[PDB]
Write an enzyme that holds these catalytic residues in place. Structure first.
Site, PDB file in Angstrom:
ATOM      1  N   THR A 141      -6.529  -2.113   3.033  1.00 31.30           N
ATOM      2  CA  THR A 141      -7.767  -2.464   3.861  1.00 31.30           C
ATOM      3  C   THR A 141      -8.338  -1.506   4.927  1.00 31.30           C
ATOM      4  OG1 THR A 141      -6.809  -4.786   3.754  1.00 31.30           O
ATOM      5  CG2 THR A 141      -8.789  -4.360   5.470  1.00 31.30           C
ATOM      6  N   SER A 195      -4.334   2.068   2.579  1.00 26.30           N
ATOM      7  CA  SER A 195      -2.915   2.052   2.901  1.00 26.30           C
ATOM      8  C   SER A 195      -2.469   2.263   1.537  1.00 26.30           C
ATOM      9  CB  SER A 195      -2.524   0.635   3.423  1.00 26.30           C
ATOM     10  OG  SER A 195      -2.748   0.531   4.629  1.00 26.30           O
TER      11      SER A 195
END
EC number: 3.5.2.6
Length: 265
Positions: free
Chosen positions: A212, A44
């Site tokens: 993550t 991300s």
């Protein structure tokens, strides 16, 4: 700095992790790093450069921030908290989506923007335009975060990404107004309270974007101001054996190693 290397290698050995770090000054000159040219999955963290791309289009007139982007339930993918709330209304604006992507890591919002800007290819073209020859977006969410061992798709390096951050925040890539807005979004990020900024002094001005992904990836990129000294930082880690809370603590630990080095100057 061998305190810096030594302390990071001890964390790697003890947590069975690989830790990639680059710290650069506002012009991209190297302050510190570790595994700085090793590729890691972005996951991300790319949503920050995506927002920068969007602001460049806004600056140039080829996008409008209040333009409404319509969608239905098919656009909801795992971890789309804002997109889910706005679903009944049937749209999010460009800016709503960009802010949700950066501050909530919203995947649906991210994919909404990807389809508007030309897909993974256009994200990669923006990296190349701002002098980043390394970072590559190959897929949309959530498959971009698969992080299959050995796959070079959807990767960056700490140094490449730190330099990209510095270009966007400090190197004139965006107008002053757009630069300020994205900086505030990073400061106000809702997902990073336990990662890098948890390991920095509380008087430093810090903004970041977390990631993550599968197979142990835990990342955080952004900026910090230690009184008047401004820096850009990228941290990418891989720790397949750790739990999620332990990976957060890993990244906060990296923040404390960074802090010792900065404080020494």
């Amino acid at each position: 700095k061998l305190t810096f290397k030594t302390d990071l290698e001890k964390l790697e050995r003890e947590k069975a992790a690989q830790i990639g770090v680059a710290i650069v000054d506002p012009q991209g000159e190297i302050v510190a790093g570790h595994r700085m040219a090793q590729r890691f999955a972005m996951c991300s963290t790319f949503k920050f450069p995506l927002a920068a791309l969007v602001f460049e289009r806004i600056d140039s007139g080829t996008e409008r921030g209040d333009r409404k982007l319509s969608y239905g339930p098919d656009m909801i993918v795992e971890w789309s908290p804002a997109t889910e709330r706005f679903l009944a209304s049937g749209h999010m604006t460009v800016l709503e989506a960009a802010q949700a992507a950066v501050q909530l890591s919203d995947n649906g919002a991210t994919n909404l923007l990807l389809r508007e800007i030309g897909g993974p290819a256009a994200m990669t073209q923006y990296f190349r335009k701002i002098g980043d020859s390394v970072s590559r977006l190959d897929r949309k969410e959530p498959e971009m975060g698969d992080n299959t061992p050995g796959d070079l798709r959807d990767t960056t390096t700490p140094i490449a990404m730190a330099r990209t951050v510095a270009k966007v925040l400090y190197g004139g890539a965006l107008t002053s107004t757009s630069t300020h807005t994205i900086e505030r979004w990073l400061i106000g990020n809702q997902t990073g309270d336990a990662t890098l900024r948890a390991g920095f002094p509380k008087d430093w001005v810090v903004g970041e974007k977390t990631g993550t992904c599968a197979n142990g990836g835990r990342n955080d990129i952004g900026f910090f101001k230690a009184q008047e000294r401004d820096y850009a930082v990228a941290v990418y880690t891989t720790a397949p054996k750790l739990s999620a809370v332990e990976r957060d603590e890993l990244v906060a630990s990296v923040g404390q190693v960074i802090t010792q080095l900065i404080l020494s100057t």
